[PDB]
Amino acid sequence: HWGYGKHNGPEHWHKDFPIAKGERQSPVDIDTHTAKYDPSLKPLSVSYDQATSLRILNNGHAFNVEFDDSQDKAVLKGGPLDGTYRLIQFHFHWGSLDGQGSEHTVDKKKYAAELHLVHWNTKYGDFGKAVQQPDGLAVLGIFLKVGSAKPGLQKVVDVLDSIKTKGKSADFTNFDPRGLLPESLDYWTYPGSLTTPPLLECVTWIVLKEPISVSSEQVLKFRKLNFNGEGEPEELMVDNWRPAQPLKNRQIKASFK
Numbered sequence: 001h002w003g004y005g006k007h008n009g010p011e012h013w014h015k016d017f018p019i020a021k022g023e024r025q026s027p028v029d030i031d032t033h034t035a036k037y038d039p040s041l042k043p044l045s046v047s048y049d050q051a052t053s054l055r056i057l058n059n060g061h062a063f064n065v066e067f068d069d070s071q072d073k074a075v076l077k078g079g080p081l082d083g084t085y086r087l088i089q090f091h092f093h094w095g096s097l098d099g100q101g102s103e104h105t106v107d108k109k110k111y112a113a114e115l116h117l118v119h120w121n122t123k124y125g126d127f128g129k130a131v132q133q134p135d136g137l138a139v140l141g142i143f144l145k146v147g148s149a150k151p152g153l154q155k156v157v158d159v160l161d162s163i164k165t166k167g168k169s170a171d172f173t174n175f176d177p178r179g180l181l182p183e184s185l186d187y188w189t190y191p192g193s194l195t196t197p198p199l200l201e202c203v204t205w206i207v208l209k210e211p212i213s214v215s216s217e218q219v220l221k222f223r224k225l226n227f228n229g230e231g232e233p234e235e236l237m238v239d240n241w242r243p244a245q246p247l248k249n250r251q252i253k254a255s256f257k
């Protein structure tokens with residue numbers, strides 16, 4: 001009823017999810033010149049040392065690498081955040097070509113892909129309760145550009161053959177998400193939403209300024225995935241990104257000058 005095709009893509013989602021035309025939708029274009037430095041922001045605290053990855057799942061729109069979120073094992077704190085946010089899963093959005101794929105844009109520039117590390121606020125007890133709150137989630141977004149390989153991505157790329165089609169999953173233990181981060185934690189932040197239906201306005205977005213580099217071969221493997229289930233007509237899982245939405249009454253803040 002929703003996807004990324006011609007007939008069910010972003011431009012249609014409002015029919016079933018009227019919040020698509022809401023006041024704090026994501027992604028947005030990040031106008032670097034109009035973002036303002038906020039000296040009172042903190043440094044981000046990314047605490048992933050005890051992360052417990054469990055599984056990787058092709059859900060028909062992306063693949064999610066899922067984590068044990070039943071304890072404070074892999075948490076995000078600081079920055080604009082009040083309290084502790086637990087990592088539940090990460091996934092990517094990517095293009096059919098290297099010139100598109102990201103959801104956020106930077107001065108209208110599209111990156112080849114975007115990584116979303118999804119975290120929920122522990123004050124709300126579980127993910128499903130957190131998405132109903134204005135400060136329920138914190139998503140760390142990281143741009144991908146094509147160049148050198150990202151070594152810490154390779155273990156993800158190499159399991160993708162085992163989850164080609166919608167509904168397939170595979171064990172994915174002992175994966176360290178720290179290997180997906182860039183050097184700098186400088187960031188922009190703003191209040192927004194989930195970027196897939198149900199498009200709930202529950203996200204504090206934290207978008208890193210510094211992209212990571214991945215190789216051609218790595219992104220090419222993303223593009224071999226399928227939106228369809230096994231035994232259905234093959235449709236490559238590409239261009240699974242929502243375009244930039246109106247900023248409306250929001251200001252994007254920068255952690256850096």
Ligand SMILES: [Cu+2]
Nearest residue numbers: 001002003008
């Ligand atoms: Cu559907």
Ligand SMILES: [Cu+2]
Nearest residue numbers: 091093116195
């Ligand atoms: Cu996402």
